[PDB]
A paper describes a structure:
In order to biochemically confirm the importance of the entire C-terminal region for catalysis, we generated a C-terminal truncation of CotB2 terminating at R294 (CotB2ΔC). Indeed, CotB2ΔC was an inactive mutant, not capable of catalysis as shown by GC/MS. Co-crystallisation of CotB2ΔC with FGGDP resulted in the open-state conformation with no substrate bound. Additionally, this data provides further evidence that the salt-bridge between D111 and R294 is not sufficient to fully close the active site. Interestingly, there are two Mg2+-ions bound in the CotB2ΔC structure. One is fully occupied Mg2+B and the other one is partially occupied Mg2+C, which can only be fully occupied if properly coordinated by the DDXD motif upon substrate binding and the accompanying conformational changes of the active site. In combination with structural and biochemical data we could point out the importance of the properly folded C-terminus for the enzymatic activity.
To elucidate the dynamic interactions of TPSs with their substrates during catalysis, we investigated the bacterial diterpene synthase CotB2 as a model system. CotB2 adopts an α-helical bundle fold that is conserved among class I TPSs (PDB-ID 4OMG17). The CotB2 protein sequence exhibits a modified aspartate-rich DDXD motif12 deviating from the conventional DDXXD motif and the NSE triad NDXXSXX(R,K)(E,D) as found in bacteria and fungi, that is altered to a DTE triad in plants. Upon substrate and Mg2+ binding, TPSs undergo a discrete conformational change from an open, catalytically inactive one to a catalytically active closed conformation.
Residue numbers in the entry:
A (entry chain A): 16 to 293
B (entry chain B): 16 to 292
The structure:
């Protein structure tokens, strides 16, 4: 099965919702050539002990979500920004990888090295723990009865799983040092930040990765909760997910102005990057 | 307004739900008089810097939730257990205290000192960070526009707020060393543990503290999302919450056996303790 018959309409309705409810467009962080080579050098060094060879073009496609989905107005720490670039990219490679090749003894110390290079001592522990928790979660739930139960029961249980499994809690806990904004720092550490952005990130990511994931037999996708071959059922389910995104976006506007900018930029920027060609 | 007309029926239906879906009864951890005195002295020392004397009796009514809602058969570390007894009690008094007497500079070192007595170096930092985040969240959100939005929009937004605000995540992150169970430790550190148990704990807590909290102008209660004065609207809302608890409980049974016993003892033990003295 496939969502191809809805690809155009659903893209348009996503963009329309964002135009009406966030308005402010995402903007791409521009890395200098120096910064980008430093980032790729770190990514390559981190995945070397696993024997993987990743092309420059691969790294650049991975890093685009960070370039598009941070909040450049509010950036204060570019060392922290580069850390997110590197941690996002190497996690991507680890999640795109045959779990038989998952060597935690070789990979985990490379994650700690990245965090220790770019963050202060306190922030390095926070960022590293979320990274460790993410990759351990991913490993723990491949072919787990829990994943099947949470992903097939209801939209609520699936998104409850996805708070961690899509990596947004990880993302928040390594991204707050970029902004040094006290309120945002707390929302990141309570995971309220991740809970507020999970659905908008996951619904978008799920729609544009449905065809690929179901072809590989993966179940971590909310559109498996409806009959995508029944146009009527699909339209109702898609409107419900838009209704979730909107509700979340409206409550996000009750947060302080910087924090709200970061959340909405993350959701809206993730849609731009996902629907972009590179 | 009041949920008093529904107290007996809802209590019976809560109990019925647990007998049908959890079956296994919660059991009370009993502390030796030495163990309990150790807990209380620590509690007292932690809150003295704030000028607070607290009776043994009041400490014991606070600690009851820990004695009832942990999973006695799986306990392996009683030092960790006493830490939870203490951290729970002193955060109770910090929650029921005037936000003007909130001295973060005095209290946070006492929390750290508790975690350092009872936990290993690594577990101390985890328990301490969750305690810090809880009391800081509690301070951030009094009179916060965010709290107003999250508690009045939808049940989903409300329970999303309570994952932290009712302290489950804190509870999970200071309780996992009690059990030394690797799956539970991960489920607690990702907060999936708190996410699975938030609604079961919140709905029961909200029902039985509704009258007190609404009379105090507090809005952190799912039952203000419905008209409790309209029996038909209240019954419908209550059944919706019962359905939430049943779905979570049925999903919890997919976790490994030890983890799910901990999750279910927590939710069921909380109900028992809530409805007791
Ligand atoms: Cl930590
Ligand atoms: Mg995907
Ligand atoms: Mg409170
Ligand atoms: Mg209450």
């Amino acid at each position: 099965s496939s969502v191809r018959p809805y690809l155009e309409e659903c893209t348009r309705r996503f963009q329309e919702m964002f135009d009406r409810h966030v308005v402010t467009r995402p903007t791409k962080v521009e890395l200098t050539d120096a910064e980008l080579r430093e980032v790729i050098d770190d990514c390559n060094a981190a995945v070397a002990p696993l024997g993987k060879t990743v092309s420059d073009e691969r790294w650049i496609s991975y890093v685009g979500v960070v370039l598009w989905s941070q909040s450049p107005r509010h950036i204060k720490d570019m060392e922290a920004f580069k850390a997110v670039c590197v941690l996002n990219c190497v996690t991507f490679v680890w999640d795109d990888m045959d779990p038989a090749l998952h060597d935690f003894g070789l990979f985990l110390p490379q994650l700690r090295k990245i965090c220790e290079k770019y963050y202060g001592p306190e922030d390095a522990e926070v960022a590293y723990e979320a990274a460790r928790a993410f990759v351990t979660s991913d490993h723990m739930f491949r072919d787990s009865p829990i994943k099947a139960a949470l992903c097939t029961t209801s939209p609520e249980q699936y998104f409850r799983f996805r708070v961690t499994d899509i990596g947004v809690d990880f993302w928040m806990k390594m991204s707050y040092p970029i902004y040094r904004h006290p309120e945002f720092t707390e929302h990141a550490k309570t995971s309220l930040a991740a809970r507020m952005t999970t659905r908008g990130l996951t619904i978008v990511n799920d729609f544009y990765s449905y065809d690929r994931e179901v072809s590989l037999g993966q179940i971590t996708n909310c559109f498996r909760l409806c009959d995508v071959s029944d146009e009527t059922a699909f339209k109702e389910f898609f409107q419900a997910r838009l209704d979730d995104m909107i509700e979340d976006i409206e409550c996000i506007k009750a947060f302080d102005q910087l924090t709200q900018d970061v959340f909405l930029d993350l959701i809206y920027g993730n849609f731009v990057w996902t629907t972009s060609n590179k």
